[PDB]
Design a protein around this nucleic acid. Structure first.
Ligand code: FCJ
Ligand code: MG
Ligand code: NA
Ligand code: NA
Ligand code: NA
Length: 326
DNA sequence: CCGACTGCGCATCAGC
DNA sequence: GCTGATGCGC
DNA sequence: GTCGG
């Protein structure tokens, strides 16, 4: 694709800033620049040309000039050579290990995949499962497997109660040919912004999926959010499917459209859209869109009857899920 | 120049 | 136990 | 690291 070279460079820089420097703004600055260049329908021929795009300022422009001229970036080359940065970067690849825990571990001389396995008593539960499935979680999910997964989740949900609606979101809903994980939006008429007239609404669904050996592990769980591990059943003599990440979000039914907009993403699209909302004087989360008052406080939830209504409020033309892959 | 940068659930820890 | 802050991941 | 005001 693209300016793949340049966007990979920026991504690597973002990851460095987040994992090593713990500089979260530089990290989102890089991700924004990577995103806007990924979308740019021209092979970038100079940093000057790139600087025209929003989110590419002077520093990134100079970096792009270097990369175009030499095929690489000295800054990254040093970072790759530095033992400590490389170690921290690697450890953050385990789910549940972030920049802080990674640096904690490196400080203790825990630097490798083997070190982690040898020190499992030093891991919290999430981290333990992330280590367990380190390999599998590196693998993307072909859309073909995503479709099989959807059929299982939806049918099992129906069996618990026919009034549940489960909607697969994330990259899948945007039409991707492969997904990093499975994002499931859940609603039930007993759970609204006005009342929860049934307890355990999410629990029952997770229970069912455990019962049929679809959900294999739990990373975290509460009343509206489940995050864990699942696996497709395999056939006689067939190798097993990799284990896969799964998140289920229970959203009040009268807030479906905000919820499905959030969970459909992408993450950077959501950020771009929420930023723009602020510029139009609204705030958007996965529940509501509310006006901001002069005082700087969110007012009362606006009526929403579609995804498009949310776009309409902030004066954006509607964009289909497939065109939100920023 | 420089304040502002999207928003939030769950796990964990600190302090009481 | 609680509250509030931080870590981590969507 | 970038940028609107
Ligand atoms: N930081 C964030 N801020 C706002 N919204 C966010 C954020 N992270 C996430 N989201 C929303 C959008 C995303 O599609 C959805 C699922 O989160 P995921 O992290 O699964 O994103 P994906 O778009 O599913 C790519 P994949 O194929 O690698 O899985 O959750
Ligand atoms: Mg996903
Ligand atoms: Na720019
Ligand atoms: Na991680
Ligand atoms: Na997910």
């Amino acid at each position: 694709t693209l300016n793949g070279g340049i966007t990979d460079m920026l991504t690597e820089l973002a990851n460095f800033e987040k994992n090593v420097s713990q500089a979260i703004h530089k990290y989102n600055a890089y991700r924004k620049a990577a995103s806007v260049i990924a979308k740019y329908p021209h092979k970038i021929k100079s940093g000057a040309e790139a600087k025209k795009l929003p989110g590419v300022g002077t520093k990134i422009a100079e970096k792009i000039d270097e990369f175009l001229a030499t095929g690489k970036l000295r800054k990254l080359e040093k970072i790759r050579q530095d033992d400590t940065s490389s170690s921290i970067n690697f450890l953050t690849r385990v789910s549940g290990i972030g920049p802080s825990a990674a640096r904690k571990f490196v400080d203790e001389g825990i630097k490798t995949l083997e070190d982690l396995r040898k020190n499992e008593d030093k891991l919290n539960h999430h981290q333990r499962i992330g280590l367990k499935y380190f390999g599998d979680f590196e693998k993307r999910i072909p859309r073909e497997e995503m479709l099989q997964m959807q059929d299982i989740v939806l049918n099992e949900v129906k069996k618990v109660d026919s009034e549940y609606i489960a909607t697969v979101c994330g990259s899948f809903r945007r039409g991707a040919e492969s997904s990093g994980d499975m994002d499931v939006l859940l609603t039930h008429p007993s759970f609204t912004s006005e009342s929860t007239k049934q307890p355990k609404l999410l629990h029952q669904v997770v229970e069912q999926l455990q019962k049929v050996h679809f959900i294999t592990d739990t990373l975290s769980k509460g009343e509206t959010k489940f995050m864990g591990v699942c696996q497709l059943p395999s056939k006689n003599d067939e190798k097993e499917y990799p284990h896969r990440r799964i998140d289920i979000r229970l959203i009040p039914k009268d807030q479906y459209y905000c919820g499905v907009l959030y969970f459909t993403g992408s993450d950077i699209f959501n950020k771009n859209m929420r930023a723009h909302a602020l510029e139009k004087g609204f705030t958007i989360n996965e529940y509501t869109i509310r006006p901001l008052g002069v005082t700087g406080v969110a007012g009362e939830p606006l009526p929403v009857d579609s995804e498009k209504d949310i776009f309409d409020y902030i004066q954006w033309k509607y964009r289909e899920p497939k065109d939100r892959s920023e």
